[PDB]
Amino acid sequence: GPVPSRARVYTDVNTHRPSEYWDYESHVVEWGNQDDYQLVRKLGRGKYSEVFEAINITNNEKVVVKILKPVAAAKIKREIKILENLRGGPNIITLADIVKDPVSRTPALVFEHVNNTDFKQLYQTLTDYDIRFYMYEILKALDYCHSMGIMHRDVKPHNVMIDHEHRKLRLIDWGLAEFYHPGQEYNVRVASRYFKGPELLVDYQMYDYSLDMWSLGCMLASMIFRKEPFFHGHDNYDQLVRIAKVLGTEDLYDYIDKYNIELDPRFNDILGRHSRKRWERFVHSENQHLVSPEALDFLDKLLRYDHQSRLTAREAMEHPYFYTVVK
Ligand SMILES: Nc1ncnc2c1ncn2[C@@H]1O[C@H](COP(=O)(O)OP(=O)(O)OP(=O)(O)O)[C@@H](O)[C@H]1O
Ligand SMILES: N#CCc1c[nH]c2ccc(Cl)cc12
Helix, strand or coil: CCCCCCCCCCCCHHHHCCHHHCCHHHCCCCCCCHHHEEEEEEEEECCCEEEEEEEECCCCEEEEEEEECCCCHHHHHHHHHHHHHHCCCCCECCEEEEEECCCCCCEEEEEECCCCCCHHHHHHHCCHHHHHHHHHHHHHHHHHHHHCCEECCCCCHHHEEEECCCCEEEECCCCCCEECCCCCCCCCCCCCHHHCCHHHHCCCCCCCCHHHHHHHHHHHHHHHHCCCCCCCCCCHHHHHHHHHHHHCHHHHHHHHHHCCCCCCHHHHHCCCCCCCCCHHHHCCCCCHHHCCHHHHHHHHHHCCCCHHHCCCHHHHHCCHHHCCCCC
């Protein structure tokens, strides 16, 4: 069968911590008072929750309430444990409280409010300097959660909130996050289609923190090249073909050979034979202002089929792409 794999960093974090840290099933939730919060307006409804802007009437402060849809108690206690473990970490959304919603009879997570800049506005107006600045801020959040034995598994633009006026960034929506345990087989039905790592697309379950780095690479590529999304697959199979049209098929076959993976036979008549493309092929007069040799080198080191070969968040912070960023 497949060859096992482990992260090259933060491998032993969860074994050295007390079991209470990662055993989220055993965690006893400390319930707050639901009357402290007055719902103001529905912000959205996702697959697993309804999000509302609300006011904390005990301090007059704006909050965001996420009322979970009844799904599975295991998924709920896991998100709570991760948010509590990560609380106070750099650029990590702060969980302010946990209440029982009187209508849904389900938990409602209360978060600090971010006066966030519109997502299209961000996509359309962030400068070269702003992309480097904010990528550096995401890297602080990712290295923190990875050093804490947690993988996000849903890195994408909508999950990265920016209040551009205050140059404030927050990594949100920890509902797909999981504790990393070496040798554990994880569910590959994670991350949004355009941000899914090749490991997910080839059904390799023994993945790790490096999945977040691929997703970050997809975000970066879309920003610097002005192509939204960068890898535009019609479904999970065509998503891998879209990647192969850029990275090529030879390195893909080397990847599956290394891990003794068998590609789903549906790929035999759709994958084709593609050479790896040079990143300069995606440069044009409308994105030249966001591209540099340092940006292309950085991207190249994130977007690699072999998960073990990608830059870690801490190595990524050392990259020349960030030398211009004020620290
Ligand atoms: N802490 C927060 N502060 C301010 N707004 C938030 C906060 N958390 C979530 N939101 C906002 O809540 C609204 C609804 O979010 P939801 O979870 O439904 O994600 P989405 O943008 O709707 O979709 P997806 O994640 O699937 O792309 C979004 O506009 C999101 O920006
Ligand atoms: N794509 C896109 C837009 C965007 C949303 N959140 C972001 C965080 C960082 C950067 Cl560079 C860009 C974004």
